[PDB]
Each structure stands twice: as C-alpha cells, then as structure tokens.
Design an enzyme around this catalytic site. Structure first.
Site, PDB file in Angstrom:
ATOM      1  N   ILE A  20      -7.159  23.395  38.056  1.00  0.00           N
ATOM      2  CA  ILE A  20      -7.367  22.168  37.317  1.00  0.00           C
ATOM      3  C   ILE A  20      -6.126  21.355  37.351  1.00  0.00           C
ATOM      4  O   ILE A  20      -5.638  21.033  36.255  1.00  0.00           O
ATOM      5  CB  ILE A  20      -7.682  22.381  35.803  1.00  0.00           C
ATOM      6  N   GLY A  21      -5.598  21.066  38.550  1.00  0.00           N
ATOM      7  CA  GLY A  21      -4.432  20.169  38.719  1.00  0.00           C
ATOM      8  C   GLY A  21      -3.187  20.725  39.407  1.00  0.00           C
ATOM      9  O   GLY A  21      -2.901  21.926  39.355  1.00  0.00           O
ATOM     10  N   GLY A  23       0.926  19.544  41.540  1.00  0.00           N
ATOM     11  CA  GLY A  23       1.901  18.554  42.016  1.00  0.00           C
ATOM     12  C   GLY A  23       3.331  18.990  42.312  1.00  0.00           C
ATOM     13  O   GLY A  23       3.558  19.984  43.022  1.00  0.00           O
ATOM     14  N   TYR A  25       5.784  19.979  40.288  1.00  0.00           N
ATOM     15  CA  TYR A  25       6.229  21.108  39.464  1.00  0.00           C
ATOM     16  C   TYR A  25       4.976  21.574  38.774  1.00  0.00           C
ATOM     17  O   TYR A  25       4.573  20.985  37.769  1.00  0.00           O
ATOM     18  CB  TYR A  25       7.273  20.677  38.405  1.00  0.00           C
ATOM     19  N   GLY A  26       4.339  22.576  39.372  1.00  0.00           N
ATOM     20  CA  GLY A  26       3.167  23.245  38.788  1.00  0.00           C
ATOM     21  C   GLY A  26       1.809  23.025  39.451  1.00  0.00           C
ATOM     22  O   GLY A  26       1.206  21.956  39.278  1.00  0.00           O
ATOM     23  N   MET A  27       1.325  24.034  40.188  1.00  0.00           N
ATOM     24  CA  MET A  27      -0.137  24.275  40.286  1.00  0.00           C
ATOM     25  C   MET A  27      -0.615  24.871  38.941  1.00  0.00           C
ATOM     26  O   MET A  27      -0.116  25.942  38.498  1.00  0.00           O
ATOM     27  CB  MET A  27      -0.503  25.238  41.419  1.00  0.00           C
ATOM     28  N   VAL A  28      -1.579  24.185  38.315  1.00  0.00           N
ATOM     29  CA  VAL A  28      -2.198  24.587  37.043  1.00  0.00           C
ATOM     30  C   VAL A  28      -3.631  25.123  37.238  1.00  0.00           C
ATOM     31  O   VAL A  28      -4.478  24.429  37.790  1.00  0.00           O
ATOM     32  CB  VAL A  28      -2.202  23.407  35.975  1.00  0.00           C
ATOM     33  N   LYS A  43       0.434  27.386  34.299  1.00  0.00           N
ATOM     34  CA  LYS A  43       1.271  26.573  35.179  1.00  0.00           C
ATOM     35  C   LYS A  43       2.065  27.524  36.139  1.00  0.00           C
ATOM     36  O   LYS A  43       2.845  28.378  35.674  1.00  0.00           O
ATOM     37  CB  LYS A  43       2.247  25.786  34.289  1.00  0.00           C
ATOM     38  N   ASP A 138      10.812  11.533  27.025  1.00  0.00           N
ATOM     39  CA  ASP A 138       9.617  11.138  27.812  1.00  0.00           C
ATOM     40  C   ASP A 138       8.353  11.159  27.017  1.00  0.00           C
ATOM     41  O   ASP A 138       7.305  11.592  27.491  1.00  0.00           O
ATOM     42  CB  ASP A 138       9.435  12.020  29.062  1.00  0.00           C
TER      43      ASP A 138
END
EC number: 2.7.11.24
Lengths: 344, 154
Positions: A20-21, A23, A25-28, A43, A138
């Site tokens: 489910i996502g 990039g 920093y992190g394949m989730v 993550k 952020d």
C-alpha cells in the site's frame, strides 16, 4: 515472501501482506499482527548507502521511540537482521491509520465542530513535541493521520530536530520534492536559528485550509510563496524587518511594493470569529510575536476542549542536537542498530 | 467547446479521451482562466504520451500561464525527466523566465532533480541566471545544503 519483486521478510508475527505505497524512504505494506489481532502498517527502509538516509532514519527512530502520546504515531515493533553486517533493511511497525487530513479535506468541507476538534488534537500533540524540545518542521495535512473515528496522530519526524539554542544552528530541510505551502516565511528567507514558532506557522496554515478547504499560501516556489504570504499579511513593519538578521533577505523585502493586510474576515467571511482571532496569532510574520503552543490551547476558540491536566508533556526531553551531520554512514549504521535493540 | 473538455482530459491523464477530442477538432491551444494549456497540464502531471501527441498536433511548446510558467518549468519542477527531453526536442526555451525570473534550472536545482539539471545544462541552460532575489542555481545548492548539486555545478 516477495511483494512487487522486493523481499519483505516480516517473520511469523506479521502475515497476510498487502502493498500500500512506496518511494524514496519506505516500501509500505499492511499486514496482520498475529499477536495483537489487528492489521498494521509496515514501513521497509534500507538507507545505508547514503548518509542523508541514515541521519533521517536514526532521528525518526530515536524520536518516535522516546514519544508516547495519543496524538503522535508510535512505533509498535521493529524488525531487523540479528547482526550489523546482515542488516540491509529495517522494518518499522506502526498503527494502520485509514486516512489523513489531506484526503479528508479533498472529500468534504469540515463543519466548525470538526475543525475545532482537529485543531485541538493537532495542538495537544504539538504541546508534547515542543515540551520534548523537538521541532517537527514538516507539519502539513498529509502528516496528520486519521482513523475512522476522528482520532488524529501527527506522524513523520524525518525532518524533525532538537531545538539547540546555540551551536550548530539548524539546518536545512532536505526533502526537496514535497509541498512547501506550510513552511514559515523565515525558512523561505533561509533564516539562521528558527524555533518552535515554525511549527505554529504550519498549524496556522492547516487551520486556514480547514476553514476554507483550500491552501492559504500555495506558492509555486520560494518567491511566489513569499508573495502569497505578504499579499494576505501585508508588508512587514520596520520593526519586523529590523528583526531579520539576514541582510539580503531584509534587503529583498525592502525592495518590494507596499501590500496592505487583508482582514481575515474578508478571506474567511463564514468562519468562527474566534478561530480567526487565533489564526491571526498563529500566522504572524514575526516568529517572536507568534502565539506559543500552550497559549494556543488556552485560546477561547478551544475552550470546550482545553484541559491542561489531560494534555501531557514529555517525561524525558531531548537535550541537544544529535550529533549527526559530520558522522559517516557506517557510524550511523551502528547507532540505528543499537536504537532498535529493545525489540530483539 | 471541445477546448474546455480537452484541458480536463489532459489534466486527468487519459490518453484515449485526448485522442478522440483531438480527432474531433479540440483546440490544442485552448487555455483555462489561469492560462494553463493542455500541454502545461500533461507536463505537470507527467503523461509523456500526451505531451507528445499535443506537440505532434501543434501545441505551443512555449505557452506561458499567468505566472509566466512554460510546460518546461512544470516538467522541471515535478521531476518529469522524459517530458523535459520531449519538450526540449520540440523547441522549448531552456532559459524561460517566470514572473520572478526563475528558469527551469532554478526549479530542478531547488527540487534536487539532478538528471534534469544535467539535461537542461546539456541544452544550453544558463547556470548564471539570477532570479529576482539574486539567486543562481549555485546559491540554491548552498542554501538547500545540496552538496551533490554543487558537485555538478562546477
């Protein structure tokens, strides 16, 4: 166990994977936690090839493991290889949150009650972060996670920093692709030592967007951001200009044509008059003149929620900058290994 | 007005709708109220094939929106490497200035899109261009703390 051609090795405790996502920093994935009987978010990070990835990863692990507060995402578990040489990857297990304030805002204009309650939760979370001597740096709607019952949890401390009064004064915002619409005008000006007050500016931008359902300062770049900001706040006073240390920043603002302040009730004619009074105190050009997190909680707009005895502070604040900038990526590899040891 | 339907189609990222509207005569150079053309929208979202067919059918490669942004600024700002190449091939003005004097190079630099910076530079981008604040791409690499950027910039 292979997901989109990547290993995703989460042992027997976590099963039933779905991607489910993914990039920078992190394949989730989501997964079932077979101990707690609930689906969780996992993550996968592999950061060891670039010093920047390691700084960011160490901070985030350190900060999230120290924090324990209902309005801040926790780390429930961490999986990593049993020896330093083996660790190519770290898996961080967190609560699975169904949505976020970014998606919500695009599906509906919030009622006044929802706005108030979300602003309460944001500030209650922020109270605890600032009480830990941390700057989030952020804050934005997508870093405000939401479950199906309006519970809010501020996550994403990859760009967070300890507030060190003196010494190595922070300290760039190096995640260059994501929105800048929530960034205080002193960051846009490349100020020296900014403070907790940058996070109160971001919260004021989020409030404004909840009131009208569109971003309040959607600049296309740093100079268009300034223009948006000055177009609503008006030209800064000499008193506020005089506070700007950076000479070419001050000189640049002095170069511009006069802009008058647009009254908040003209931009937001149907918003609660108290939310607007609070908004005014958050979105103050001068960082020193901005309301602080405790005074915002005690503002009349939030009177129905404000309960100091149920608004906890950190039992162990962070003391100093983690001394990371000069440290090489092999060294950072060591501390990440040690930070993660409490989980096996 | 097919013009109005083409913009949305382009902003949506639908290759087939774009084609059908264009086959029926949609104005490739239509614009919304903020001056975005279908080429700007496809270059912003990152639809390489759509950017191609619009250019193929006469889209103004250098159209400016009301902030002075060209399709190339959008592509550069949003990390769309192939799209930058395609635009350049079709005569995009590598040194286009927006209202504030930022060029596509300023934008790629500030976003840290290194491959795009290299492509812009190879196509005659002006590394010494100054925005209305005075900043070049170099000052951006110093201000943002991008040491890898400052690596290619000398």
């Amino acid at each position: 166990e292979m997901v989109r051609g990547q290993v995703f090795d989460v042992g027997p405790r976590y099963t039933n994977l779905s991607y489910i996502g993914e990039g920078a920093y992190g394949m989730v994935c989501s997964a079932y936690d077979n101990l707690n009987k609930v689906r969780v978010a996992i993550k996968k990070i592999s950061p060891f090839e670039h010093q920047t990835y390691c700084q960011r990863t160490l901070r985030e692990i350190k900060i999230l493991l120290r924090f324990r507060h209902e309005n801040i995402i926790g780390i429930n578990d961490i999986i990593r290889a049993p020896t330093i040489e083996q660790m190519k990857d770290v898996y961080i297990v967190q609560d699975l949150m169904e949505t976020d304030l970014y998606k919500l805002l695009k599906t509906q204009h919030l009622s006044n009650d929802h706005i108030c309650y979300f602003l309460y939760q944001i500030l209650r979370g922020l109270k605890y972060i600032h009480s830990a001597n941390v700057l989030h740096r952020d804050l934005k709607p997508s870093n405000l996670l939401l479950n199906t019952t309006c519970d809010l949890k501020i996550c994403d401390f990859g760009l967070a920093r300890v507030a060190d009064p003196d010494h190595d004064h922070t300290g760039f915002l190096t995640e260059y692709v994501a929105t800048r619409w929530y960034r205080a005008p002193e960051i846009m000006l490349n100020s020296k030592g900014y403070t907790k007050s940058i996070d109160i500016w971001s919260v004021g931008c989020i409030l404004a967007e909840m009131l009208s359902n569109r971003p309040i300062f959607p600049g296309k770049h740093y100079l268009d951001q300034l223009n948006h900001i000055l177009g609503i706040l008006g030209s800064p006073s000499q008193e506020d200009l005089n506070c700007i240390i950076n000479l070419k920043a001050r000189n640049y603002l002095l170069s511009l044509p006069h802009k008058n302040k647009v009254p908040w009730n003209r931009l937001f004619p149907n918003a609660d008059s108290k939310a607007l009074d609070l908004l005014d105190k958050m979105l103050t050009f001068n960082p020193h003149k901005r309301i602080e997190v405790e005074q915002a909680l005690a503002h009349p707009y939030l009177e129905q929620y404000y309960d100091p005895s149920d608004e906890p502070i950190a039992e162990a604040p962070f003391k100093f900058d983690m001394e990371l900038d000069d440290l090489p990526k092999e060294k950072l590899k060591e501390l990440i290994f040690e930070e993660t040891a409490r989980f096996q | 007005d097919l013009g109005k339907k083409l913009l949305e189609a382009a902003r949506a990222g639908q290759d087939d709708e774009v084609r059908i509207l264009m086959a029926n005569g949609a104005d490739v150079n239509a614009h919304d109220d903020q001056g975005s053309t279908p080429l700007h929208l496809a270059a912003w979202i990152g639809h390489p094939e759509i950017v191609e067919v619009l250019l193929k059918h006469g889209a103004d490669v250098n159209a400016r929106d009301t902030d002075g942004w060209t399709p190339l600024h959008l592509a550069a700002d949003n990390g769309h490497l192939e799209i930058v190449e395609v635009l350049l091939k079709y005569g995009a003005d590598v040194n286009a200035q927006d209202a504030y004097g930022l060029t596509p190079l300023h934008l790629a630099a500030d976003r840290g899109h290194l491959e795009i910076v290299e492509v812009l530079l190879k196509h005659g981008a002006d590394v010494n261009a100054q925005d209305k604040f005075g900043k070049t791409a170099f000052d951006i690499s110093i201000d943002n703390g991008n040491e890898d950027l400052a690596e290619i910039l000398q």
